[PDB]
Amino acid sequence: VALSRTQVCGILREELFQGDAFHQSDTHIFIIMGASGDLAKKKIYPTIWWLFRDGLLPENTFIVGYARSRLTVADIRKQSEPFFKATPEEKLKLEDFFARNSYVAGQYDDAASYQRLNSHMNALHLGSQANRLFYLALPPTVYEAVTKNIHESCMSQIGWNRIIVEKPFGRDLQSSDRLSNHISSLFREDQIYRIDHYLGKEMVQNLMVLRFANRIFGPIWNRDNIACVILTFKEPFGTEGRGGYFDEFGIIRDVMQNHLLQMLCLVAMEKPASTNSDDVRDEKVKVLKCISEVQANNVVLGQYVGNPDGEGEATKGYLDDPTVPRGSTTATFAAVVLYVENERWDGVPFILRCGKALNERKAEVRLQFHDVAGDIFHQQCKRNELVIRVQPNEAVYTKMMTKKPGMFFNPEESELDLTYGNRYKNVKLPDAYERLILDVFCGSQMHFVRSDELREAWRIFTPLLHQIELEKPKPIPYIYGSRGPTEADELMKRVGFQYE
Amino acid sequence: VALSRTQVCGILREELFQGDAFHQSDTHIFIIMGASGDLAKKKIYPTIWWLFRDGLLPENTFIVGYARSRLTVADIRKQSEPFFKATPEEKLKLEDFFARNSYVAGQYDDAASYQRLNSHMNALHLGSQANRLFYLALPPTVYEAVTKNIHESCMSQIGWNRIIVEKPFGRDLQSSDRLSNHISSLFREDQIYRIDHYLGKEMVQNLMVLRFANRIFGPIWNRDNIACVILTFKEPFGTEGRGGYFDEFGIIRDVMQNHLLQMLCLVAMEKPASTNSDDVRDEKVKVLKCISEVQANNVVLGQYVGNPDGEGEATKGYLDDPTVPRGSTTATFAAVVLYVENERWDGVPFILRCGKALNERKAEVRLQFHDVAGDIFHQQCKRNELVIRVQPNEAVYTKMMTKKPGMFFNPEESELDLTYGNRYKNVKLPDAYERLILDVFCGSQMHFVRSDELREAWRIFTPLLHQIELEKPKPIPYIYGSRGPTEADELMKRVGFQYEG
């Protein structure tokens, strides 16, 4: 039997209600700092709406917008409601949602503006007691000011205070440390939520059960059995005339140093002492501490060019973006190989491969197993694989050999679906991002990057990023819609990976 | 895409043709010694018919019946054809089949009778050159005479000569050795086919690919990961007024010392040097040599009694069989635990559990894996299993833990079908026994018990069988249609097995 999207929300609501960590009865205030900006308009307001609509917020929740512009809730609603995908059935819930919304104009480094915000909050029903959740939907160039002022003027004295922080988390170890040390002098680790929009909560929890609940998979999750691991993140669209911001960061900073490294950690970790957030993040950090600074011989960069035979956007290269400097050498593609130098993984290449303007949307973890030690089937045996796909359609499946009916033993490659076993025919999930914000309401930090974790991430990548900035290597061109530079394929072959 | 019975036979015929082992061009003679008897009538003639019909015999194959009774092919046909399950589509093939049939009346210890059989064979088209395949469908009490006479009078000088031999393969080490030494002084090991009717050729070959072609299963196929192995053989019917012959053997000799021990060997074997029959049988023998003589404390015997609440035969106990001695102590049920004392298996109980008048038909291999080393999911994790069912309906599947959708990590037990992977939806195969006779045409001895293998099988069980015969322990009663004596459950719990509740 299948589970609808609405039945999954019933199960979740019931779990939130039974559990101590989500306080359904207490008052909550959700503060969107930067409520006028595009992130708020297109992602945050719609998503807090989805939570509200799904019955997954505490019943007493208020949304307070705060930005420089002098706006009404009516304005917020006009700019944001198109991205809510609201239906006619939801007209009542949408009224009730907007009734819980308010806006406060202010400057980001003006103490008086923050006192108005605090008074505004205090003036809500039970505002002085509410749990306060601050979403910092702002460039990190104002984070020092905003976190300073929030701490001085805006903290609940009764409820908890939690802040959600957006990438970039610096651009290297030293800038990351300046920002992280600043925020840490004001907020405890258990108040800081560094979010990863791309972390697929359902698939990472599937993976943990698959590995840690089962003798079939746990004993082969090591270098004696695994030839390589591939972490793939692919977008088919380029920068869409908006690449100016990206151009200052590049693909490694954008998605690899943060998101792909988290996935590596979840694949490579030792079994945690428990499923508590900090036991799990302890094991994520132990992994990073076993990884050496990556060197350039393990890296292939590319930059997309237009396709002469394309139509629409496909005909334009990265440099044809009007907001991108002519002769920028910033990479829109990287393939990178890391090693986890410990008992479980030494020698196993972890291959991170991502880019824009590629052939498909795909986000995926692939374990490719070694060949059998001694093939009694005339070399017909392909390497087994375990694939966890997140980004197009979620799936867990194992590629393996099976007998073809007939005389003697002719194995053929086959696939089995391990997504929810035999149990559930269809499963329609809540948005992963919706679930991630819900985590912050529940006090669950497992899938958010910890300070120690972040430092290790920057140590790994920083020598290389500095070297790229100083040596300015020309990245390899690749046609829009292709799989990227063929040199990425060569790096993968060279370190142990097999295609056909 | 699903595969019909006819499509599977197309694939097999093509394989027989491309392979050097089959010889689609040679003439073959299939001799059913004991053609008048029940086994021929109900199993052998039907099965050689199914081979013929399926297009799996060499084009020039003759079937020669031989027994004492003075019969025609018309007689054979009348008694056997009901068990052929022939349809209207097959009317022409059935004519063609019976045209290839002949019968010779003869005594089993009469050299003149065997010369007539040899002359009869020589007189067939290319008879003097044909491969000759002798099915000894006779009690083993005449095997010495029959194999002596066949060797003296009936061997091709040009084609190969192969004999199929039926259990019982003796009743202990000494009797087995007398019979086997006799047959071996006349026939090479490559001519002797000791058959096991119950060996499911398709599932055994599936299993070999599953284990040996994959990193998923091969590395955990050992004592570090497997808590116990269960080999189950269950019939829901009792002896049906025919238990007189069984009564002289008991359930261990009947199905365990032969069939279940072969299944153990296929589960426990090391990876062979190749898939050649004798590399594989070498590994089956290495296993047996690592097994000690089984002791009585590891054995539970039972004997069925009638069910007061039943209907039909279910109301009658084993002793209510008119052909069974009053107060026979013969076991209709056994549960036995063996150990393979080697690097791969030491400590792992191999539990052989079989009998008659039980709750269902089942033939099955079950690997129960150890619990996870430290459970971070609050002890909700059940042991993984790999199950290969042969009857009632073939299946390979794995019990494992999966995440329930929702907030935390609530694993639930689930089953995955591994049989043909995703590839083949529905599959109708030829009978395993059909495939086993075909193996003899192909020269493939993999699934037939070898002389050295047989000796090891008897060494393992002979002290116990002698002890049972001499101390005559009373077997434990169990109601017809139950799962057998609950003491069998206790032996299984005692050695490390976990029930599902």
Side-chain angles (χ1 to χ4, degrees), chain A residues 149-305:
Chain A
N149 277 275
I150 286 177
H151 185 264
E152 275 184 24
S153 319
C154 289
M155 309 278 273
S156 193
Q157 317 278 166
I158 308 310
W160 48 246
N161 301 280
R162 285 157 176 167
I163 67 173
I164 302 167
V165 156
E166 291 279 1
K167 81 184 167 103
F169 311 129
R171 64 190 287 102
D172 64 1
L173 185 53
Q174 264 201 208
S175 58
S176 177
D177 287 347
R178 209 241 324 112
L179 181 52
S180 168
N181 296 352
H182 170 81
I183 299 175
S184 286
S185 64
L186 302 168
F187 292 93
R188 302 195 299 285
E189 195 68 44
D190 65 14
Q191 302 174 293
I192 304 163
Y193 287 72
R194 314 195 179 75
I195 198 162
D196 177 5
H197 279 56
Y198 299 118
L199 200 130
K201 176 146 180 283
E202 251 293 315
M203 281 332 250
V204 321
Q205 295 188 143
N206 229 82
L207 177 298
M208 279 187 61
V209 169
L210 221 229
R211 179 184 172 191
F212 293 131
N214 298 300
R215 202 140 268 279
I216 88 102
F217 277 108
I220 65 180
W221 209 282
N222 56 58
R223 66 207 284 304
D224 295 334
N225 293 275
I226 293 177
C228 59
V229 177
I230 317 94
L231 309 162
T232 296
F233 189 99
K234 299 171 58 161
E235 276 150 353
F237 37 68
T239 54
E240 314 262 56
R242 286 140 136 67
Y245 312 51
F246 175 83
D247 190 56
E248 278 163 34
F249 288 93
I251 190 69
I252 300 202
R253 285 195 191 77
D254 187 40
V255 78
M256 177 167 321
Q257 173 276 350
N258 40 34
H259 176 59
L260 286 184
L261 206 47
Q262 219 200 135
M263 292 310 302
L264 187 159
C265 287
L266 293 166
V267 172
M269 61 184 300
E270 300 297 324
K271 186 153 107 232
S274 84
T275 61
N276 292 343
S277 284
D278 282 313
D279 287 332
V280 168
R281 300 211 288 178
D282 288 351
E283 303 300 341
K284 298 187 305 162
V285 170
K286 213 312 204 31
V287 168
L288 296 178
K289 294 188 179 213
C290 299
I291 302 172
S292 290
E293 5 258 281
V294 61
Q295 321 253 133
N297 62 97
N298 276 333
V299 174
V300 167
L301 299 190
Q303 184 188 98
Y304 70 97
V305 299

Side-chain angles (χ1 to χ4, degrees), chain A residues 18-69:
Chain A
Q18 218 183 87
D20 308 313
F22 182 96
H23 295 278
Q24 341 83 314
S25 300
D26 296 352
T27 306
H28 294 71
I29 302 160
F30 187 78
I31 310 95
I32 305 164
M33 309 293 288
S36 58
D38 284 337
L39 180 61
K41 162 208 290 256
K42 297 180 161 198
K43 251 285 223 267
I44 306 169
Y45 269 106
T47 299
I48 198 73
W49 156 245
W50 294 328
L51 283 170
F52 180 81
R53 175 203 70 191
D54 283 346
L56 288 175
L57 291 185
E59 29 158 22
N60 292 307
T61 301
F62 300 96
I63 301 89
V64 179
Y66 180 96
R68 309 136 313 310
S69 351

Side-chain angles (χ1 to χ4, degrees), chain A residues 15 215 271 384 407 412, chain B residues 15 215 225 373 407 424:
Chain A
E15 268 170 359
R215 202 140 268 279
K271 186 153 107 232
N384 297 165
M407 318 282 307
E412 78 223 319
Chain B
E15 268 165 22
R215 270 208 175 282
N225 292 277
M407 296 281 70
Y424 308 112

